[PDB]
């Protein structure tokens, strides 16, 4: 049986960890909601 517990407020934090790349991926969304790469 599942349950929810609060974890925080939804707010933008000025000056936070700036990390991660921004790629252009070619993808396919199937009927089961799963993503897959297309080449």
């Amino acid at each position: 049986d599942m349950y929810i517990e609060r974890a925080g407020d939804i707010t933008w934090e000025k000056d936070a960890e700036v990390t991660g790349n921004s790629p252009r991926l070619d993808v396919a969304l199937d009927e089961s909601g799963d993503f897959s790469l297309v080449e």
Partner: protein, 156 residues
């Protein structure tokens, strides 16, 4: 029970101890999360009970108590923040610039951040503080890294 706006963890007791299966967003009396996390099952908030209202496996989204309320969208230009709530660790804003998922039906935003599966459902935010989507449904690329889509539902 608790219906305060904010980010929540989705936990379970069917496994050893307590396990975090995902995350969600409570807003306007409605609890928004990813479908794969709950599988459309009813949730419990304290002694209160949340029931599913709307859901769709292809979109991989589900809302409790009411219809989907989050409607802000990524502008295609600005940097965004992933409010990651990882299993057992404190909520943490990780700012990034999103990429693109090119599908036959149109382009979708994408965040290339790496978090455990139990973080599925964490809100993606804009400079205004508006939830522009949920993190947790994506693909694994060449180098084993994980890239999630910016999954946003439709409002009524």
């Amino acid at each position: 029970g608790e219906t305060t706006d904010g980010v929540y963890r989705v936990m379970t007791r069917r496994l050893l101890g307590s396990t975090q299966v995902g995350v969600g967003v409570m807003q306007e009396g409605v609890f928004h999360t990813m479908w794969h996390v709950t599988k459309g099952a009813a949730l419990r908030s304290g002694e209160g009970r949340l029931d599913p209202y709307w859901g769709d496996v292809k979109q991989d989204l589900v809302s409790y108590c009411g219809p989907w309320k989050l409607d802000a969208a990524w502008d295609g230009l600005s940097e965004v923040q992933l409010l990651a709530v990882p299993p057992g660790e404190r909520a943490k804003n990780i700012q990034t610039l999103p990429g693109i998922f090119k599908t036959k039906d149109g382009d979708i935003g994408a965040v290339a951040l790496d978090y455990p599966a139990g973080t599925s459902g964490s809100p993606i935010l804009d400079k205004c503080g508006r939830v522009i989507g949920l993190y947790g449904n994506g693909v694994v690329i060449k180098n084993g890294s994980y890239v999630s889509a910016i999954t946003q539902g439709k409002r009524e």
